[PDB]
Design a protein around this ligand. Sequence first.
Ligand SMILES: CCCCCCCC(=O)SCCNC(=O)CCNC(=O)[C@H](O)C(C)(C)COP(=O)(O)OP(=O)(O)OC[C@H]1O[C@@H](n2cnc3c(N)ncnc32)[C@H](O)[C@@H]1OP(=O)(O)O
Length: 428
Amino acid sequence: SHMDASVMSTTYALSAAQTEIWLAQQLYPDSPVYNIAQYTVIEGVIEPAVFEAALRQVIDEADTLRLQFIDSDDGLRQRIGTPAWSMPVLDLTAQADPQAAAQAWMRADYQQPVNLTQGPLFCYALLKVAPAQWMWYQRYHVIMMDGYGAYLIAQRVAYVYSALCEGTTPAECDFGSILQLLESDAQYQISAQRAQDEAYWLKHCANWSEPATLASRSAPVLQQRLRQTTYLAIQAPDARRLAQFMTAAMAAYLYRFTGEQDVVLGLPVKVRFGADRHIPGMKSNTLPLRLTMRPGMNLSSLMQQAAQEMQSGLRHQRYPSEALRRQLGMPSGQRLFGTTVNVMPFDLDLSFGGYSATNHNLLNGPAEDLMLGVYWTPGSHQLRIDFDANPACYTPEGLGAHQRRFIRFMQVLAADATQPIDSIDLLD
Ligand SMILES: CCCCCCCC(=O)SCCNC(=O)CCNC(=O)[C@H](O)C(C)(C)COP(=O)(O)OP(=O)(O)OC[C@H]1O[C@@H](n2cnc3c(N)ncnc32)[C@H](O)[C@@H]1OP(=O)(O)O
């Protein structure tokens, strides 16, 4: 049939990362766990018609927002399309609990199933929760947006809105096109770079243990994450050393609870080199990071190991960890890591028409087991630490107990970096 021929002729293949997302989503086409979402709280007055004009401009500028997915013989295909969208504006200020009402509205959306061929794949909404307090809600399916991409979009919307508010022309966007990102990925899939990367990871992981984990069971994730959130003063570094510390601390904690001495963690990374640093879309990967719990090691030796792992492996970060699992001949369902340490050193602050604003994550993708999410504006004296967990594997209270124990443990670690991790009392 000519209609199938025309679909193939007018579309692009999924990238490697998108393909892994599509396959995972196909296993549970009703699981909403492939959404990411956040809201930006603005301390001021937002004019919705100007905000919507800013969103129209950024939907033109970031063409990943206009991707449409179409089923095909060779699987899912995509093109720059004409997605239907609107921007709900809800004034909740007369409600008994406007904040709770806003959270419930956002939650109702990000729990909605997202059919990839019908969309909508993103949602933008404005919620007024007090006099001079607005929330801009942002939701994406990860097949077309990752964390850094969402950050780029929020920065650009704030800038464009600010220009439109003051009646000036926004300076030209520095975004590249998603089609260039897809073409570069297609070339990488058949490049020599990829073969070197594959060799590196096959060597690095070639003798693997079943992952160390705090859970009594491992299970696919079907449900949205259980989340425990704690805010931490930084007195308890740059992004790289914050990641070194967080991975070392989580590995030491896993070792103290399970005794496992070969600890493999997941390290989400941006996979954004060169031009791809300016293209909103889905690029990110998650790397296996191995830390060997030796007899007597302290925090310093562990962060030494983590720094070495990152210096050795970040250059090879393009190689998808799912492809790595297949190439290693791992059994179906078996993972290289259970616990992931997702450090997001992305500026949380924005300015909208001269009004201060801050970003707050709602969903950060699927929680297969446990994910430590760390949100830090570089330079700030404050961290947000999320424990995101598979509800099939943890309880809210058990997760909260783990998070309190972990926060205390990590503070005692940072208090004396020469002290043996075996010598530290926990909270139990
Ligand atoms: C809607 C709300 C949003 C929801 C969020 C969505 C959540 C998701 O599921 S998506 C993932 C979100 N998380 C992230 O993006 C994680 C970001 N964090 C990280 O990447 C790691 O924690 C972190 C901090 C260690 C990365 O450190 P970083 O310094 O940025 O490393 P990175 O730039 O990637 O690579 C550096 C290394 O790459 C190597 N490299 C190879 N080629 C190059 C090249 N052309 N250029 C530069 N470096 C290169 C180098 O060896 C380099 O090392 P060095 O500069 O010292 O010589």
